[PDB]
Design an enzyme around this catalytic site. Structure first.
Site, PDB file in Angstrom:
ATOM      1  N   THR A  47      33.866  95.837  12.221  1.00 14.75           N
ATOM      2  CA  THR A  47      35.037  96.712  12.095  1.00 14.75           C
ATOM      3  C   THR A  47      35.959  96.082  11.063  1.00 14.75           C
ATOM      4  O   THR A  47      35.828  94.879  10.771  1.00 14.75           O
ATOM      5  CB  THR A  47      35.729  96.914  13.439  1.00 14.75           C
ATOM      6  OG1 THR A  47      36.329  95.693  13.864  1.00 14.75           O
ATOM      7  CG2 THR A  47      34.771  97.424  14.490  1.00 14.75           C
TER       8      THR A  47
ATOM      9  N   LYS B 155      40.151  94.714  13.409  1.00  5.96           N
ATOM     10  CA  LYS B 155      40.476  93.790  14.514  1.00  5.96           C
ATOM     11  C   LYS B 155      41.058  92.524  13.899  1.00  5.96           C
ATOM     12  O   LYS B 155      42.194  92.581  13.425  1.00  5.96           O
ATOM     13  CB  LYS B 155      39.250  93.498  15.362  1.00  5.96           C
ATOM     14  CG  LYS B 155      38.788  94.620  16.261  1.00  5.96           C
ATOM     15  CD  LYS B 155      37.579  94.153  17.040  1.00  5.96           C
ATOM     16  CE  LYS B 155      37.175  95.093  18.129  1.00  5.96           C
ATOM     17  NZ  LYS B 155      37.016  96.448  17.558  1.00  5.96           N
TER      18      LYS B 155
ATOM     19  N   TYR C 217      36.716 115.190  -1.831  1.00  7.44           N
ATOM     20  CA  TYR C 217      35.332 115.142  -1.289  1.00  7.44           C
ATOM     21  C   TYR C 217      34.455 114.378  -2.263  1.00  7.44           C
ATOM     22  O   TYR C 217      34.553 114.644  -3.454  1.00  7.44           O
ATOM     23  CB  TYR C 217      34.715 116.511  -1.036  1.00  7.44           C
ATOM     24  CG  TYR C 217      34.365 116.689   0.416  1.00  7.44           C
ATOM     25  CD1 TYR C 217      33.338 115.977   1.011  1.00  7.44           C
ATOM     26  CD2 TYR C 217      35.139 117.510   1.218  1.00  7.44           C
ATOM     27  CE1 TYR C 217      33.066 116.104   2.365  1.00  7.44           C
ATOM     28  CE2 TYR C 217      34.867 117.662   2.570  1.00  7.44           C
ATOM     29  CZ  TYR C 217      33.829 116.957   3.148  1.00  7.44           C
ATOM     30  OH  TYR C 217      33.572 117.108   4.481  1.00  7.44           O
TER      31      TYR C 217
ATOM     32  N   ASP D  23      27.036  91.191  14.608  1.00  4.12           N
ATOM     33  CA  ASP D  23      28.178  92.124  14.738  1.00  4.12           C
ATOM     34  C   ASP D  23      29.436  91.285  14.910  1.00  4.12           C
ATOM     35  O   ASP D  23      29.805  91.011  16.064  1.00  4.12           O
ATOM     36  CB  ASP D  23      27.981  93.108  15.883  1.00  4.12           C
ATOM     37  CG  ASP D  23      29.085  94.146  15.976  1.00  4.12           C
ATOM     38  OD1 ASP D  23      30.054  94.100  15.160  1.00  4.12           O
ATOM     39  OD2 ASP D  23      28.989  94.965  16.885  1.00  4.12           O
TER      40      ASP D  23
ATOM     41  N   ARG E 187      41.317 101.200  10.324  1.00  2.00           N
ATOM     42  CA  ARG E 187      40.195 101.464  11.264  1.00  2.00           C
ATOM     43  C   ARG E 187      39.025 102.012  10.458  1.00  2.00           C
ATOM     44  O   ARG E 187      39.174 103.067   9.845  1.00  2.00           O
ATOM     45  CB  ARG E 187      40.599 102.402  12.386  1.00  2.00           C
ATOM     46  CG  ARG E 187      41.854 101.919  13.077  1.00  2.00           C
ATOM     47  CD  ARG E 187      42.075 102.692  14.326  1.00  2.00           C
ATOM     48  NE  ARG E 187      41.264 102.084  15.353  1.00  2.00           N
ATOM     49  CZ  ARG E 187      41.667 101.140  16.174  1.00  2.00           C
ATOM     50  NH1 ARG E 187      42.909 100.690  16.141  1.00  2.00           N
ATOM     51  NH2 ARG E 187      40.825 100.685  17.075  1.00  2.00           N
TER      52      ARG E 187
ATOM     53  N   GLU F 219      30.923 112.909  -1.389  1.00  2.00           N
ATOM     54  CA  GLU F 219      29.563 112.629  -0.873  1.00  2.00           C
ATOM     55  C   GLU F 219      28.764 111.872  -1.936  1.00  2.00           C
ATOM     56  O   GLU F 219      28.839 112.225  -3.139  1.00  2.00           O
ATOM     57  CB  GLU F 219      28.846 113.926  -0.504  1.00  2.00           C
ATOM     58  CG  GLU F 219      29.319 114.510   0.808  1.00  2.00           C
ATOM     59  CD  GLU F 219      28.873 115.943   1.015  1.00  2.00           C
ATOM     60  OE1 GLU F 219      29.134 116.767   0.111  1.00  2.00           O
ATOM     61  OE2 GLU F 219      28.279 116.225   2.078  1.00  2.00           O
TER      62      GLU F 219
HETATM   63  C1  LIG Z   1      29.412 123.404   8.053  1.00  2.00           C
HETATM   64  C2  LIG Z   1      29.743 121.947   8.000  1.00  2.00           C
HETATM   65  N1  LIG Z   1      29.333 121.145   8.978  1.00  2.00           N
HETATM   66  C3  LIG Z   1      29.609 119.821   8.933  1.00  2.00           C
HETATM   67  C4  LIG Z   1      30.330 119.221   7.936  1.00  2.00           C
HETATM   68  C5  LIG Z   1      30.550 117.722   7.949  1.00  2.00           C
HETATM   69  O1  LIG Z   1      31.817 117.202   7.425  1.00  2.00           O
HETATM   70  P1  LIG Z   1      32.074 115.613   7.103  1.00  2.00           P
HETATM   71  O2  LIG Z   1      31.764 115.457   5.626  1.00  2.00           O
HETATM   72  O3  LIG Z   1      33.532 115.338   7.426  1.00  2.00           O
HETATM   73  O4  LIG Z   1      31.121 114.792   7.981  1.00  2.00           O
HETATM   74  C6  LIG Z   1      30.749 120.044   6.888  1.00  2.00           C
HETATM   75  C7  LIG Z   1      31.471 119.460   5.768  1.00  2.00           C
HETATM   76  O5  LIG Z   1      32.632 119.651   5.517  1.00  2.00           O
HETATM   77  C8  LIG Z   1      30.454 121.425   6.926  1.00  2.00           C
HETATM   78  O6  LIG Z   1      30.832 122.292   5.964  1.00  2.00           O
HETATM   79  C1  LIG Z   2      31.588  93.657  18.525  1.00  2.00           C
HETATM   80  C2  LIG Z   2      32.085  95.063  18.391  1.00  2.00           C
HETATM   81  N1  LIG Z   2      31.293  95.982  17.836  1.00  2.00           N
HETATM   82  C3  LIG Z   2      31.712  97.265  17.710  1.00  2.00           C
HETATM   83  C4  LIG Z   2      32.955  97.693  18.097  1.00  2.00           C
HETATM   84  C5  LIG Z   2      33.315  99.153  17.989  1.00  2.00           C
HETATM   85  O1  LIG Z   2      34.304  99.480  16.969  1.00  2.00           O
HETATM   86  P1  LIG Z   2      35.115 100.868  17.070  1.00  2.00           P
HETATM   87  O2  LIG Z   2      35.883 100.806  18.386  1.00  2.00           O
HETATM   88  O3  LIG Z   2      36.007 100.851  15.826  1.00  2.00           O
HETATM   89  O4  LIG Z   2      34.107 102.016  17.077  1.00  2.00           O
HETATM   90  C6  LIG Z   2      33.801  96.749  18.697  1.00  2.00           C
HETATM   91  C7  LIG Z   2      35.141  97.076  19.162  1.00  2.00           C
HETATM   92  O5  LIG Z   2      36.123  96.452  18.854  1.00  2.00           O
HETATM   93  C8  LIG Z   2      33.364  95.419  18.834  1.00  2.00           C
HETATM   94  O6  LIG Z   2      34.157  94.474  19.379  1.00  2.00           O
END
Ligand SMILES: Cc1ncc(COP(=O)(O)O)c(C=O)c1O
Ligand SMILES: Cc1ncc(COP(=O)(O)O)c(C=O)c1O
Ligand SMILES: Cc1ncc(COP(=O)(O)O)c(C=O)c1O
Lengths: 475, 475, 475, 475
Positions: free
Chosen positions: C241, C244, C60, C215, C250, C62
């Site tokens: 992204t 692609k 972790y 984008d 990803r 953050e």
């Molecule tokens: C209660 C709660 N909500 C939401 C999250 C959000 O997790 P993430 O850091 O994967 O966005 C956490 C973190 O682990 C959490 O403890």
């Molecule tokens: C121009 C563009 N923006 C955003 C995205 C969204 O990405 P993702 O599907 O990883 O959320 C795509 C999808 O390929 C895309 O072609």
């Protein structure tokens, strides 16, 4: 054709429209013969009404004195500048510390203009809950619906009375406020019997970095006459209607701090920032041209508000209300907060075994104006357990203290006759109550007896705004 | 102090506020001696003013006829029901197809109440742009700021004029509407001298599944006299002010469709959805207690608006405007849109070598009240390149046609003297013009003699709403 | 060591999950046997997959490198700093003019984080219309419903193609932008065969004082190899992204300007204000902990993106696409925009008398992955008349010169067989087509022949990210 | 050069990117040598890492199983359907009463997708205050700034702990809820040592007509093994990470009620209304293509979560935490709430005359990972008064109980060394603490007084996810 339409324009109301002239004559009779105990109602002076019905209504004057869009406003500029000067003068305001906008068309729009000026949409307001004595222009949403548009365009949370004492719970409001982070707090009520702790409100506000708005609509007259502490001691912005306690035309005023707020910790000048925003929110923000006829009327009202006659009248409003509350309690009634500091009383009828809708209906068919009111202890808000009553209207007629004792005795009679109609009621909903009230003739007999006593008592007193002689409905 | 304040309530305005009584007498003299050319201004009847200055202002009547919060509104209910009846009657509307709200305090709030009723915050409006002829209640935003509040609470995009013709570009509007997907489209303007194509706007709104709101503030009287096509033929919701073309008190009305809209393809019948929403947006949404004095006045204004004298007067304002346009073409001035179909002429002063500011200043010196205006072709906002002038005000007094030719001649004299002052000014900004204009003894001589000619022509006509005799200012 | 588990934590995908191990083996066979022509698809390197499958997922972390919440991120900080350094290097960016955020989880959230950082809720965005080649993360609403959440929290209006040329209509974009006043404009497409005019986009944004977001998700690899004009030449903010054309894991990246914007032709020193806002919108604004396993993988992908092998691959993607478009045109097909500048082609099947859905179904039965695509002339979204295909995936496997000529031949075979199956259909709907295609044995024979040709061709090429030798489903 | 680029794609990580391979080997050594007490951290199985590092990352599959946009998703559909089935099974959920979305990329976006699905923008959320143990994804704003974008797009108000008892103040939450009228309430915490009273929050939500969202991120493992009460007994929606107590890959799940909700007592069946809204808010609303590699990993994690050795491990996490809390109390430490119901303790270091920052610094230099934490009663945050510690990570490595007694003893030693450095702190500010701690070889050699003890004790335990033998940094 040419002089015919010119004579149509100059023909009096009695010649061109008999039906409206007749409706006005009926309403004159009703105001003469009736007990007016609705605390938001009053009788406006003939001087104010003559200015309101003047040719000042013809002039379009978009903008402000010395910065208008249209020409030919020299006299309109004189009237509006005089109105501003007299407004600041009535409430003892240093013109370099306080500014005033007198173009606001009424109370509800005046508050909405303050919110639009000082808050971004969806920013947070705290105000006194409506079933606890707040106004709709503070915000209100039920379990189910957004009622006031203030709740649509801004995020509103209420603060409530202490259910046991009937005063505002400032300990729960401060706690609420730390959690809710309001950008503005409203100190202002319609159905509240007591004076605001403006000092406590200012403390809660500058701790929460919030704007203190006072809605003194109900008590503005009282603060012009110095009988109750002035919200201008602590508020950042004060709104009022012009037509209640203050007894002027139907309109509004927005006062705001201007000039220097303070020196901050780096030695720079913090300047108040409400004037430009409020003036622009009013025009061109939410209104167009001002109603110069109502501004002229308000100027006359504000000149009256500074006289000794006016001070006498409002200390009479207070004394009449103290004696009215004493009479009501000695007759065996519960007041919320158990008295009054001002112009109204809120009676809690829950212990007498009848609510406010039935009492209000009986009182109205006896020509006594009150209004149903929710009370602490009410399960619903649709079924109000209380009655609200006030002095200012009848006191303007020249009612003194003995007179309010007689009105309390007639109110007692009204409540007891309403209890009799509820006992004999052929159902439990309000329609069944009114059915048995107009389907038994014993009750209609006692209603007319009460009405007769009210009319004989009211007619002894002077008419305000017209002369008794040139009426149409003498009998 | 017992009865000593009752006389203060009933005393006349002359013995109450001598300063306001005097300011009103000054303004009466100005209306009598003056060429009133401001197209949004008019002269209101004595009947209207007597009802507006009545004790109807004293009654609180939150809610609607037969559904008020307070009691004792028998007579107020009579007045409001009569106002609604006369409103529907003045525009030839089936009461089963059209409903009216008469409680709206003015035009800007009336439109805002329609938006609040029919749209969620931030939903989309299309409207005619401001510098091409729109009103602020339609929305406006420059490269810098949100001026009108509508653009704060809703998302607004304008449609523009065909820059060569001066009519509305109905194609760019259809294209931009398919892209913008508006929920409501506003048809109606201020500085627009032509009448709209309601049929094509209904077609666009039906295509985009959008609400058609017509703002007929500028032409309401002209629609009530049947001298121009009725927007009620095609519109969903019609708002208007009561003060300008309609010639009543300062207020507004909202008309809305009710009953059967159409039958859907599944066989079911769909009803309109505007009445309840609009009535609730007005109260308790954005307003409080109605102004029953203005409602009474509006009822009498609407009764006048159905008579043959009124139809004659509106055909007169049209004919006066045609003759005014021709009399200006003979002098050699440019009308934007290439003429007029209605009550206003917007003179395009750019190609005469002078702006709107200087001409308006000199005209105000000559007791000829018109207003600066921006036409298509200007350089910025507050450097105006046009003058707006209207017939309805002077026509109310009995101006005939040849009388507006004399008005055009004295306006030509004003603009010619203004050109004489501008060329001889040592500087180029408005300040040098105003400095040299009244430190002259030559141009000041010409100004006093023009004003003399203006007053001689004006004083001949009857005073509207009061008697020439008891004018505290004769000459 | 003191345990009843750990046994299962260190066990391979072995019997821990035979069903998922099996599903992965099936998918490996599918990636080996088939023509992958979906232009947003690619085959990731084994080194990227090994870094994504590492214990970096356990930490972790953050916050940002050297500004984290938790201790023990010295090595995670090394990986993220290396990722940022290699990101700026792979696009030839001065670290003192550009910064990068590599924590964004995917494309759609990356754009939403840019909007949240730079715009207040309900501020205005323009983007390429989704049925014209845009993405959902740019905004999409139908006549009845908001589809993309960007359209819920921001106000979105599309710009369209010229349906006659097949290129973006920049004229109508500039016009509609003048009306709509967007705060941000998106230069970015999916189903678009041509290169953006970033210079014209810059000019429009500089005119409207608006933010240029590019984008480049579909062309990021092409931009990294420099075989296509770089949007970093003009854009304020670039999103992509990572999975692609760039061929990494990803994920997503946000690049932004930092340091001096311009000495500015009107006064003070203006610094770019994007870094802090974007970094805070990503965390703590909208995401929690970074996915350090994905960030490590991305660092490996970005190192590969700077090599000559990588440049060769991307110029091959372009050359393969040119030759593929030539073969498609020489076999009688129509391409939207009439060709390609990039990695994909849009075939317009409308002149061949069949839709994209039927051709896609037949191609899938033959193990040719493509996808239906709307084309200008298509009435609705429900029935697309085109097919989208692209070269990055099979080019990764080493498809060279004439291999896309074989792809064109087998696509042509699929279209012709699809026409035969449409002819023999009993009904008009796609269900009847699929019924005939699976349940008519005539077509079954030719389906097996083309699937066989497809598989015998694909199987010859190397498998990406695993060994053919260890494939549970080798034959 | 097509042989190049092919080989670059199939080359292992140690060959392509020695720098990233090295950073991963460093992090492996760090995971081996240390006490991991950060309660949000865990060690993922090699099974899920191998699935996350698979070629499933290559497939684009926007949409849902059986309703995708692209073809060739037969095996991805198998994996997602298996993941859904195993998710509902691992939490003992009736598939006709509960549904699950497994495409959500992480915890913070998962909550944002629930809000976006079930609330209009600016609607109201209540959640546990962040300094009292809440999460940023539930909303957070300070006096000056909005921290979480949840507070930007929705209106958020916190509920607090009872500052003396260390349990949630459910009375104050119910009171706050009456006033604030929330549409959704979050039962979910990140530094809260007790189980929620889900039944009480069901009662509050049923009263306020509000949605009960459980956020079981921290306890999902414990709920899966059935060793703590399941929030599904009461919640309308449950969200979770996949990567904390549950021990899967970094991702998230959204569970929701589906099917019959109740009979409206008017005769009608009313259906739950979460599934379509949540599924559409995830895609196409806020996300694009699912991360199928993470979904495969999650499927493996969920299969492990149903095994008896998994239940043993979670029972162990609970028992280890009870014994850790007992050891801390017998050594004189203050635990917020006086103990634990779950996997963590919040130690209130202020009772020992020190804060969280100084203790965290000393613990980190000794390779004991904890984190500073606000305890209720702190004089603001920035300098927190607590340390947060948890058992899941080291329990995964096989720490048994006596092992957590050793953890407690070495933590106690770290705190006492930090107290010795604070005694020598010339000043009170944190910079002087770090100066004294580094530059005073007495403390530097006592720091290695632990670290050595910690490192030897950690090294005696199994490595999770990799082999001790194949490690690079084994000395
Ligand atoms: C209660 C709660 N909500 C939401 C999250 C959000 O997790 P993430 O850091 O994967 O966005 C956490 C973190 O682990 C959490 O403890
Ligand atoms: C121009 C563009 N923006 C955003 C995205 C969204 O990405 P993702 O599907 O990883 O959320 C795509 C999808 O390929 C895309 O072609
Ligand atoms: C406290 C308070 N504020 C504002 C208003 C608004 O008044 P109006 O009905 O004139 O809009 C009222 C009502 O009179 C009020 O009592």
């Amino acid at each position: 054709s040419r002089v015919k339409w010119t004579k149509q324009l100059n023909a009096p109301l009695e010649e061109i429209d008999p039906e409206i002239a007749d409706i006005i004559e009926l309403e004159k009779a009703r105001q003469w013969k009736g007990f007016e105990l609705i605390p938001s109602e009053n009788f406006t002076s003939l001087s104010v009404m003559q200015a309101v019905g003047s040719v000042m209504t013809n002039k379009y004057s978009e903008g402000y004195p010395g910065a208008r869009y249209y020409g030919g406003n020299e006299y309109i500029d004189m009237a509006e500048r005089l109105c501003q000067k007299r407004a600041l003068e009535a409430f003892n305001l240093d013109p370099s510390k306080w500014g005033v906008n007198v173009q606001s068309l009424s109370g509800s729009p005046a508050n909405f203009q303050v919110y639009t000026a000082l808050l971004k949409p969806h920013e947070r307001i705290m105000a006194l809950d409506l079933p606890h004595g707040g106004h709709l222009s503070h915000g209100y949403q039920t379990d189910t619906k957004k009622i006031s548009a203030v709740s649509i365009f801004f995020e509103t949370m209420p603060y409530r009375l202490d259910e046991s004492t009937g005063y505002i719970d400032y300990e729960q409001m401060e706690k609420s406020a730390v959690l809710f982070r309001p950008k503005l707090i409203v100190a202002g009520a319609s159905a509240y019997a007591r004076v605001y702790d403006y000092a406590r409100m200012r403390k809660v506000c500058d701790k929460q970095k919030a704007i203190l708005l006072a809605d003194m609509a109900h008590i503005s007259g009282l603060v012009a006459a110095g009988v109750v502490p002035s919200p201008f001691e602590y508020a950042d912005v004060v709104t009022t209607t012009t037509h209640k306690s203050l007894r002027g035309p139907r309109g509004a005023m927005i006062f705001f701090r201007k000039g220097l707020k303070e020196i901050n910790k780096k030695g720079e000048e913090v300047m108040y920032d409400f004037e430009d925003k409020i003036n622009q929110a009013v025009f061109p923000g939410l209104q167009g041209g001002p109603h110069n006829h109502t501004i002229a009327g308000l100027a006359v009202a504000l000149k009256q508000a500074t006289t000794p006659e006016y001070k006498a009248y409002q200390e009479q409003v207070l004394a009449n209300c103290k004696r009215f509350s004493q009479s009501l309690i000695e007759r065996g009634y519960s007041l919320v907060s158990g008295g009054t500091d001002n112009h109204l009383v809120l009676v809690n009828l829950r212990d007498k075994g009848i609510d406010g809708s039935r009492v209000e209906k009986v009182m109205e068919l006896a020509h006594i104006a009150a209004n149903k009111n929710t009370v602490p202890g009410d399960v619903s808000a649709m079924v109000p357990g209380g009655i609200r009553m006030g002095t200012p209207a009848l006191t303007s007629r020249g009612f003194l203290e003995e007179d309010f004792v007689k009105v309390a005795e007639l109110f007692d009679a009204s409540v007891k006759l309403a209890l009799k109609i509820k006992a004999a009621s052929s159902g439990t909903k309000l329609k069944d109550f009114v059915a048995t009230m107009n389907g038994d003739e014993k009750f209609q007999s006692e209603i007319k007896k009460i009405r007769g006593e009210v009319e004989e008592y009211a007619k002894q007193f002077p008419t305000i705004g017209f002369e008794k002689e040139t009426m149409k409905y003498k009998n």
